[PDB]
Amino acid sequence: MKLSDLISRWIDVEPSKNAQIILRDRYFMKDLDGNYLETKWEDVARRVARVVATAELLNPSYKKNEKLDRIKEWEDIFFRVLKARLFIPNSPTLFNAGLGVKHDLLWKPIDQMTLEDYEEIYRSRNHLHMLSACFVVPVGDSIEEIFEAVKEYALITKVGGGVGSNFSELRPKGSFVAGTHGKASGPVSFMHVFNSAISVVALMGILNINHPDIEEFIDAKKVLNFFNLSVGFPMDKKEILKLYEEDGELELSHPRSTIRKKVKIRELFRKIATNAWKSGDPGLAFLGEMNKYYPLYPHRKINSTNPCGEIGLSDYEACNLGSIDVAKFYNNGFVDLEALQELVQIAVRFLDNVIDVNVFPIDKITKAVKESRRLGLGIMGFADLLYKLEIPYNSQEARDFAANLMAFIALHAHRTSYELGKEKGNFPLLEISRYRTEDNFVPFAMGMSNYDDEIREVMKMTKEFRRNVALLTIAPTGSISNIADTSSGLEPNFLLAYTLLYVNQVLREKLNPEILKRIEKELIEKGSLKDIPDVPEKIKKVFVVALDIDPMDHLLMQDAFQRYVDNNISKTINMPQSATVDDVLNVYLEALRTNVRGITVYRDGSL
Amino acid sequence: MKLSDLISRWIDVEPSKNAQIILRDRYFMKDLDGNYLETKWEDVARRVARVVATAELLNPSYKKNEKLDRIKEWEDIFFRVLKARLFIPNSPTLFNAGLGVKHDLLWKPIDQMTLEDYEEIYRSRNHLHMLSACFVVPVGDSIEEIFEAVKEYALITKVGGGVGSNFSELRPKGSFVAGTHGKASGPVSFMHVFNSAISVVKALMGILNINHPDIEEFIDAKKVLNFFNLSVGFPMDKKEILKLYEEDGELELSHPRSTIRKKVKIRELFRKIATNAWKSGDPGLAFLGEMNKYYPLYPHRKINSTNPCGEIGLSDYEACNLGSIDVAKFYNNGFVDLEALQELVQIAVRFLDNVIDVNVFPIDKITKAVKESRRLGLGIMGFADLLYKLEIPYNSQEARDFAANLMAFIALHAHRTSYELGKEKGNFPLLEISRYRTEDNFVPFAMGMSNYDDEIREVMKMTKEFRRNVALLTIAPTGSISNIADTSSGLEPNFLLAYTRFPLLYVNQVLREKLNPEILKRIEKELIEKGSLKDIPDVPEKIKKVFVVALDIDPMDHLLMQDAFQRYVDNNISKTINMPQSATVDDVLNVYLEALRTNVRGITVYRDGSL
Ligand code: B12
Ligand SMILES: Cc1cn([C@H]2C[C@H](O)[C@@H](COP(=O)(O)OP(=O)(O)OP(=O)(O)O)O2)c(=O)[nH]c1=O
Ligand SMILES: Cc1cn([C@H]2C[C@H](O)[C@@H](COP(=O)(O)OP(=O)(O)OP(=O)(O)O)O2)c(=O)[nH]c1=O
Ligand SMILES: C[C@H]1O[C@@H](n2cnc3c(N)ncnc32)[C@H](O)[C@@H]1O
Ligand SMILES: [Cl-]
Ligand SMILES: [Co+2]
Ligand SMILES: [Mg+2]
Numbered sequence A: 001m002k003l004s005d006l007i008s009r010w011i012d013v014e015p016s017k018n019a020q021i022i023l024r025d026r027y028f029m030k031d032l033d034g035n036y037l038e039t040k041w042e043d044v045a046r047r048v049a050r051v052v053a054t055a056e057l058l059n060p061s062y063k064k065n066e067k068l069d070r071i072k073e074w075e076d077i078f079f080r081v082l083k084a085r086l087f088i089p090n091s092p093t094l095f096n097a098g099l100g101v102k103h104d105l106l107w108k109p110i111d112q113m114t115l116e117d118y119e120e121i122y123r124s125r126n127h128l129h130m131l132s133a134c135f136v137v138p139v140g141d142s143i144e145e146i147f148e149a150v151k152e153y154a155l156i157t158k159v160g161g162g163v164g165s166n167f168s169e170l171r172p173k174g175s176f177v178a179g180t181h182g183k184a185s186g187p188v189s190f191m192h193v194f195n196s197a198i199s200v201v202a203l204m205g206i207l208n209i210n211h212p213d214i215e216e217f218i219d220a221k222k223v224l225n226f227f228n229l230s231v232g233f234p235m236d237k238k239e240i241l242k243l244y245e246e247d248g249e250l251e252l253s254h255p256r257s258t259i260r261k262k263v264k265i266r267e268l269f270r271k272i273a274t275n276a277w278k279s280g281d282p283g284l285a286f287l288g289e290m291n292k293y294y295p296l297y298p299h300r301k302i303n304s305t306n307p308c309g310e311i312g313l314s315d316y317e318a319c320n321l322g323s324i325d326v327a328k329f330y331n332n333g334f335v336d337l338e339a340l341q342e343l344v345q346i347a348v349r350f351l352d353n354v355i356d357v358n359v360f361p362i363d364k365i366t367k368a369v370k371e372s373r374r375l376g377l378g379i380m381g382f383a384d385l386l387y388k389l390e391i392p393y394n395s396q397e398a399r400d401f402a403a404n405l406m407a408f409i410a411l412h413a414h415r416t417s418y419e420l421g422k423e424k425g426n427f428p429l430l431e432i433s434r435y436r437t438e439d440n441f442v443p444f445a446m447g448m449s450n451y452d453d454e455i456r457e458v459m460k461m462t463k464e465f466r467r468n469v470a471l472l473t474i475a476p477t478g479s480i481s482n483i484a485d486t487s488s489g490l491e492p493n494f495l496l497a498y499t500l501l502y503v504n505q506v507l508r509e510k511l512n513p514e515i516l517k518r519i520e521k522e523l524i525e526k527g528s529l530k531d532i533p534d535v536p537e538k539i540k541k542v543f544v545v546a547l548d549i550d551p552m553d554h555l556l557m558q559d560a561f562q563r564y565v566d567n568n569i570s571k572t573i574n575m576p577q578s579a580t581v582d583d584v585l586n587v588y589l590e591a592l593r594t595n596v597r598g599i600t601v602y603r604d605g606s607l
Numbered sequence B: 001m002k003l004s005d006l007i008s009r010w011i012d013v014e015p016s017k018n019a020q021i022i023l024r025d026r027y028f029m030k031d032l033d034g035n036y037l038e039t040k041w042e043d044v045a046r047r048v049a050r051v052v053a054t055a056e057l058l059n060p061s062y063k064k065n066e067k068l069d070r071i072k073e074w075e076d077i078f079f080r081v082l083k084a085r086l087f088i089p090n091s092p093t094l095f096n097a098g099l100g101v102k103h104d105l106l107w108k109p110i111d112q113m114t115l116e117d118y119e120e121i122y123r124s125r126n127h128l129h130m131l132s133a134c135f136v137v138p139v140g141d142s143i144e145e146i147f148e149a150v151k152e153y154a155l156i157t158k159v160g161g162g163v164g165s166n167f168s169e170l171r172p173k174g175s176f177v178a179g180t181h182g183k184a185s186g187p188v189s190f191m192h193v194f195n196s197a198i199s200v201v202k203a204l205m206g207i208l209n210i211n212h213p214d215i216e217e218f219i220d221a222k223k224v225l226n227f228f229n230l231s232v233g234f235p236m237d238k239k240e241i242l243k244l245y246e247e248d249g250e251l252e253l254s255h256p257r258s259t260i261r262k263k264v265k266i267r268e269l270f271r272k273i274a275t276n277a278w279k280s281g282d283p284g285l286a287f288l289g290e291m292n293k294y295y296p297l298y299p300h301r302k303i304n305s306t307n308p309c310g311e312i313g314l315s316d317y318e319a320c321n322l323g324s325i326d327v328a329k330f331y332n333n334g335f336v337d338l339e340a341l342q343e344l345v346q347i348a349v350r351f352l353d354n355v356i357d358v359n360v361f362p363i364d365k366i367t368k369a370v371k372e373s374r375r376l377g378l379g380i381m382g383f384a385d386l387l388y389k390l391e392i393p394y395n396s397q398e399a400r401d402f403a404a405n406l407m408a409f410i411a412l413h414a415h416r417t418s419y420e421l422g423k424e425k426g427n428f429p430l431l432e433i434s435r436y437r438t439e440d441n442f443v444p445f446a447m448g449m450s451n452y453d454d455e456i457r458e459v460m461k462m463t464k465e466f467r468r469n470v471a472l473l474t475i476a477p478t479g480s481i482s483n484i485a486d487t488s489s490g491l492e493p494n495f496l497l498a499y500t501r502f503p504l505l506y507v508n509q510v511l512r513e514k515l516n517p518e519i520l521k522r523i524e525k526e527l528i529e530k531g532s533l534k535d536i537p538d539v540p541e542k543i544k545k546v547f548v549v550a551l552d553i554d555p556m557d558h559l560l561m562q563d564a565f566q567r568y569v570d571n572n573i574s575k576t577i578n579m580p581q582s583a584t585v586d587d588v589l590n591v592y593l594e595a596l597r598t599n600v601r602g603i604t605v606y607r608d609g610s611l
């Protein structure tokens, strides 16, 4: 059906009292006296839609006469899509849209908006108007660069950004410092400062596997409570796998130190596994794998991710995200690829426009975003969608469907970026990117869909016109999925029921209302359906939660999506409390064989 | 006696075994490979004198055809004064003079030096060539400013500076924050970040004003912040605060960017401070209002903070280099050789002012603030030992009159020298807007305890016209440089007459000259044990009275000595008010009230047995 039909079915559906708490809590704009400027989700949609459609001011394809019409059109479509909660941008966009803009412009009826009005919104966006979630900054090997980075951290965190860095440039603890004839503190010690900084104003800290301080880093939490830590693998994944299998040795070294050392790669991996087994940190960041698909590599280079891993970013680059709720696209046992296609084109445009009306706390970031125009279009509602299609999450069926769904989005996303590159101009760096200097460059692995051939061609076309360097991600959507009363990102539901009691909205519609009342006592207790008597088999099988799905089944779902995502993916590999450190190692080894670009594990009941 | 002859008496007196250990440890320069480029104090003196003499290149009264001879004469005089240890600049000068310069230039014999050698020295000073002890930077009420200040702490600390800040601009904990509708973390929380920053760079002063809404929390901050010394700031008139106390009044704690507002009994507030200092020796008191009363640039510029040890009150981004004269070496048959001292004060002021010219700061704002004000910190050390030689008890009116007079004498000549240097090299850029020119009868200290007052007043009138420096004097702890000079520290009494640090024996050398060597071997054991002569039998009453140590001297006599000196010092003074273990919190409060009445610009107390 038409997207406009789908909008009708949804646009009048108000958020659950549950989502309404979150909204009143931190999304509804309040003035300085504290009073509410927004009291209904609808008000948010209007403000955001109006701000992001303002970008069309810059559109060189629009005649000045029609300029007001075009803008009003995009506002409306952005608005409708936003109010129906079919697509939602990252929290910073919802938080900060229109900050600095007069309160008489952001909500007034769209029929009263003049060109004057929009031009005014554009000009009055203030230094707080920061609409992107994900940042990376470098941390150079000097006191000067280090503390400039600490300041950068505080500035980005102030405006609601999440920032990460690779700290491997910092020379190892004990290394010679010429300027003081003393000895260097080492990266782990400096990280404590970044931590202290943020504790008064969420972070990704990466150290490469071959840094002499890697071992101290791996145990750094047992303090750095505001960091997620990942171990960095800048080399090819194949290469590390090979070394591990040969029980080979890895040389720890650094350019600005005489400190060097041999360590068994297996012992290094076991150290990481043990710590992760204990506490869920550190993760693995396959940086070399990210650059392999980075269109600007090696002119520019990905060294780190944002805090949740889903976006690989070069120095000073930032990325804005948004997700589509695919559970809302269910229609009589099928995914509505007609409405969805339309929505992808709209979302890519919305996200690309966000860049235009975005304000960053640092000029180097502004430059980097303008050069690349990286976007992060993703999905939520996936698990709930499977529930509707009655497909077990932990099944090859699920994974084939997943790869297929992502492929479709990937194809239409890059299609749209082609058209946007045509209408508005390419990203300035297209010319030096592999989309131009290579033949058959594809931003991701593929190999699990019938769509591949059509994707391979649309990549060829972006040799001439491309608005964005990369387009796709799967984020955690923790907060925006609660607003969209749907499941989070690509994750299965963690629980089907929990306390006022809640029961999954889709389980509610399949299961016999009678049974629901009986088993619920046990369900909230055991957090699963699989050992509850007299529940239809195919309901136990369909309505699986995170912990019903074994580690490998989580991994391979991540693989499936990653094959059609040119950025990274947020995926927790959940693990039974009974898992051993070896079980964790096996996940790492398997991960090295798949196409995943990062690994995060959490063993149930370990913290 | 001419200075040149005092120099001969001291120049070949070798530093003690103790001083040489310190010099080897930290002051003798090394190459990248840990090898010694310097092995004797003489080498340090040559290096420093040469680098500081190099400033004379910039001297507009020298002709291109005389500069070489004038520079060599200054290096010569600087060298001999230094080697003799009659005057020694602050540690960073000893540490960093010469950094960047070819090693075959820094110790080359002076007779072989060319005009091009000196210009090469001047040009090769590297970014680490930072020769000043004392810095203050602002910390504005924004995330931007805060972390810019943290960055500055790191940079200043790297190159060897000590930095202080007044944190009172930071809005109270819990205050409204516009950009996030969040709540401010507060000055105390932010100070934890500055502390964390210093913890990884291998010392700070932290001030919060008495009327800040978080003052109570600040006062309790260390009861974490291990690198900070903390003082409470008093930006109002000392008189106003004493009167409020005496009238049992209340103080409005408020802040301009916060609705967080509160009333407190100034007496309860003081007792809290005194209670804390009683336990732990912190926080101190900083009389900023009293510093500003005497600040030649107030109120265009304002002193909001001191450096870590409190002796220099500095405006934002201002820095100051210090140097101290060992007055114990000026003792000559029962009197202070004022003829020699006058000459050394003249040379010392020029040396310190030259340091500015060859200094390299890590931040442009600092560089600018120093060039505009040219503030100096000439002080003294060896004061206690000098009193030992004159046979004057530290805890007497006689000693305090002597001190005020000694200090007035130095101040007169240092300031006369500034006039001269301003006439020769140019005035400090801001003279024109200072109170030396805009005001009549401006004197930058209280006076009132010397026959030198009228003469000081005359010279201050003169400096309306010519003046090289905004201020010239201080008394520093001189913890390390007094050890190098083998003399007592700053204006402090000796803490002990016989002791050991980490190691071995220090035994006061003036004691070792007066006391009967027989009686010395006798009491030596008891002395180290009891840390004082006070009640050791078989020791002459005369000696007991002169050879008093810090804890022999009651708190008021410590305080009154500080006041005597402060009447003739244009910056501030580092002084510990030592108190006996039996001291009460009321005893502390009394020290405070008396401090409010005297001319001291700050107060630090320590009760024996606190920590
Ligand atoms: C400079 C100084 C400081 C500095 C040191 C940093 C710097 N900028 O150099 C600062 C501001 C941190 C400081 C603080 C205090 N100090 Co203090 N300090 C001195 C001073 C004047 C210099 C000593 C020195 O540099 N020696 C040379 C080096 C080579 O020898 P060192 O032994 O290795 O020096 C180190 C230690 O002495 C240490 N240190 C500093 N203060 C204290 C105090 C004690 C009790 C100890 C054990 C060590 C110690 O710091 C030095 C390295 O920086 C001496 C008095 C003197 N001797 O002239 C005191 C002195 C040791 N300090 C003293 C005191 C009491 C304090 C405070 C507790 C008092 C207060 N009111 O705040 C505070 C708190 C810190 C502490 N004591 O733990 C007393 C000790 C009394 C006693 N019975 O032990 C002394 C003797 C001063 C006095 N006139 O009474 N101090
Ligand atoms: C100055 C200083 C640096 N460091 C660390 C921070 C950086 O990782 C590294 C480089 O510091 P830098 O600030 O660049 O030191 P430098 O230029 O004076 O010396 P060099 O040329 O040898 O680099 O050393 C410390 O750990 N402690 C210190 O006191
Ligand atoms: C942004 C922020 C500020 N602060 C404190 C630090 C400063 O003391 C003070 C001001 O910070 P600012 O950086 O000035 O915050 P702001 O400009 O957005 O808010 P306002 O316009 O009201 O000044 O608030 C925090 O404690 N946490 C924070 O997250
Ligand atoms: C022992 C040395 O420590 C310095 N010191 C310790 N605390 C302070 C303070 N709060 N203010 C000024 N100086 C202080 C004293 O000035 C003394 O010289
Ligand atoms: Cl195990
Ligand atoms: Co979580
Ligand atoms: Mg360096």
Ligand SMILES: [Mg+2]
Residues within 6 Å of the ligand: B141, B142
């Ligand atoms: Mg502000």
